[PDB]
Amino acid sequence: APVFQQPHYEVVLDEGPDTINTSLITVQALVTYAIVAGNIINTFRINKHTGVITAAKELDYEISHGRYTLIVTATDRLTSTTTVLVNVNDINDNVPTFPRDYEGPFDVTEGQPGPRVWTFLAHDRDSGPNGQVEYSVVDGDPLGEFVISPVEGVLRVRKDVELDRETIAFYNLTICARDRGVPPLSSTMLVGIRVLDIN
Numbered sequence: 001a002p003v004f005q006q007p008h009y010e011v012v013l014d015e016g017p018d019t020i021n022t023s024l025i026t027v028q029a030l031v032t033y034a035i036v037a038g039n040i041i042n043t044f045r046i047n048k049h050t051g052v053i054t055a056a057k058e059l060d061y062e063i064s065h066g067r068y069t070l071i072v073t074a075t076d077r078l079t080s081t082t083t084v085l086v087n088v089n090d091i092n093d094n095v096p097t098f099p100r101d102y103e104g105p106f107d108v109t110e111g112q113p114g115p116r117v118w119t120f121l122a123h124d125r126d127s128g129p130n131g132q133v134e135y136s137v138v139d140g141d142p143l144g145e146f147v148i149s150p151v152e153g154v155l156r157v158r159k160d161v162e163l164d165r166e167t168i169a170f171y172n173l174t175i176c177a178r179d180r181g182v183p184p185l186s187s188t189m190l191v192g193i194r195v196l197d198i199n
């Protein structure tokens with residue numbers, strides 16, 4: 001019955017398109033080699049003779065949550081088993097994404113201080129800082145009457161500010177979502193605000 005040289009095998013790599021068709025690791029027992037489980041969307045290939053595990057597809061932190069766990073067999077017909085942990089580091093490869101490019105119209109009454117508009121949320125598929133999102137208003141607020149809370153994405157008129165329909169009747173605000181990855185990724189959406197008469 002064949003003896004695996006290591007009790008478990010392990011490697012740590014950055015996810016990304018540079019991983020396609022690279023040799024990750026070679027397992028050895030003392031004889032033919034297979035991956036029998038943990039091979040997510042056929043990411044991996046084993047050389048049946050040489051025992052080298054190659055990435056057929058891009059290593060992806062978002063599919064693996066940072067670790068692929070492969071069950072490998074060695075057979076001559078007696079069989080023995082091990083595990084191959086392919087540990088993956090997260091890179092900033094997902095843009096913070098709003099589900100719609102435009103939402104509107106959101107009604108707001110003139111003549112009242114600090115009314116709420118609505119909450120916007122961009123999703124980021126990355127983890128850690130790479131997945132954390134900061135919100136801002138980057139256009140369409142020429143008098144500085146609005147704020148979006150930078151973590152919670154709540155758009156409101158500033159506390160001690162009242163709108164006035166005759167001054168400005170409609171706003172189209174560009175909202176920016178920026179992640180805390182290096183380099184950072186961002187996207188924008190458009191918010192349509194209609195200002196209502198105090199009747």
Ligand SMILES: [Ca+2]
Nearest residue numbers: 060061062093
């Ligand atoms: Ca990825």
Ligand SMILES: [Ca+2]
Nearest residue numbers: 061091093126
């Ligand atoms: Ca990532």
Ligand SMILES: [Ca+2]
Nearest residue numbers: 094126130179
């Ligand atoms: Ca990101």
